[PDB]
Amino acid sequence: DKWEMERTDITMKHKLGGGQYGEVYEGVWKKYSLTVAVKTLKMEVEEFLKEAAVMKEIKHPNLVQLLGVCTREPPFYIITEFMTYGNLLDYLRECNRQEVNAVVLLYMATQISSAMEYLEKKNFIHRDLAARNCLVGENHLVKVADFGLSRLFPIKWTAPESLAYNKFSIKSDVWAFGVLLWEIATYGMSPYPGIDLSQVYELLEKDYRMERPEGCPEKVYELMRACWQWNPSDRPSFAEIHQAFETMFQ
Numbered sequence: 721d722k723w724e725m726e727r728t729d730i731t732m733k734h735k736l737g738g739g740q741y742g743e744v745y746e747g748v749w750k751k752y753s754l755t756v757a758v759k760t761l762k763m764e765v766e767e768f769l770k771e772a773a774v775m776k777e778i779k780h781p782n783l784v785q786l787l788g789v790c791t792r793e794p795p796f797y798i799i800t801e802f803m804t805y806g807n808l809l810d811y812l813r814e815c816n817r818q819e820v821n822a823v824v825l826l827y828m829a830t831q832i833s834s835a836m837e838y839l840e841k842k843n844f845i846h847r848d849l850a851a852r853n854c855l856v857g858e859n860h861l862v863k864v865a866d867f868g869l870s871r872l873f874p875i876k877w878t879a880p881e882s883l884a885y886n887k888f889s890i891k892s893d894v895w896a897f898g899v900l901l902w903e904i905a906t907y908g909m910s911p912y913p914g915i916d917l918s919q920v921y922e923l924l925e926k927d928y929r930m931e932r933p934e935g936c937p938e939k940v941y942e943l944m945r946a947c948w949q950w951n952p953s954d955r956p957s958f959a960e961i962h963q964a965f966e967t968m969f970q
């Protein structure tokens with residue numbers, strides 16, 4: 721296996737983002753003195769190795785790049801490139817809005833839609849697509865974190881068909897993407913603020929959708945609304961979503 725590393729190839733450093741991603745650490749891959757991120761497991765082994773195998777198949781500019789794995793005996797490692805600025809939700813909430821302005825919001829939306837178009841075409845689904853599971857690099861680079869991928873839950877990001885019948889599709893990710901776009905357009909506000917988690921489905925069932933955020937262009941809000949179509953087959957494809965963002969650039 722070309723991905724297999726000895727644990728001693730890595731020097732473990734500090735826990736990343738004060739433990740928000742659980743057991744994810746900064747490390748150094750000694751071969752290149754390259755700062756990396758390392759997810760560890762010392763219960764959920766079957767799950768951890770299945771994700772390791774899935775990440776070997778994925779290669780896109782906007783998905784976090786696997787570098788190696790330690791999957792022989794515990795502790796188990798997944799090693800990726802280090803995204804320097806951390807998760808997109810905290811980044812939006814804390815950013816300088818003079819820098820992170822309309823064109824950067826569009827750029828962030830376009831990048832994530834590019835990653836999801838790739839997964840759509842490669843018959844993968846994400847099971848936790850949200851701003852907190854996107855990572856930021858230099859010059860407003862955004863990559864989707866890829867530990868929760870499957871080959872084909874977070875209630876406020878979950879399509880109605882997934883809450884009701886536990887059924888997930890690429891169309892469920894299109895719903896989640898619309899919530900993520902809402903997170904981008906509000907610089908990382910909590911969706912459905914103050915609404916009890918048990919009543920989200922019944923509100924959605926009676927055609928409730930979140931209102932246009934302050935300053936959100938109408939074309940961007942129309943695309944959110946298309947992502948939140950009740951019928952999954954009425955939601956646009958990630959290919960259509962990416963193309964719509966490309967077209968908006970004036």
Ligand SMILES: Cc1ccc(NC(=O)c2ccc(CN3CCN(C)CC3)cc2)cc1Nc1nccc(-c2cccnc2)n1
Binds near residue numbers: 905968
């Ligand atoms: C995709 C997106 C989603 C949301 C937003 N929202 C905002 O841009 C915005 C504007 C005003 C506020 C409100 N704000 C409150 C505080 N006071 C001080 C300022 C105003 C909030 C968000 C922009 C975008 N970006 C976007 N959308 C469509 C087109 C473009 C675009 C930009 C440049 C060139 N071509 C296209 N850029």
Ligand SMILES: Cc1nc(Nc2ncc(C(=O)Nc3c(C)cccc3Cl)s2)cc(N2CCN(CCO)CC2)n1
Binds near residue numbers: 737738799807
């Ligand atoms: C939570 C967090 N992660 C960061 N970067 C990461 N790179 C990649 C990550 C990741 O999880 N990889 C991964 C692995 C390893 C396995 C499977 C799947 C995947 Cl995707 S986590 C940076 C960061 N920072 C804290 C805050 N700082 C600013 C202070 O103001 C910036 C730095 N915090």
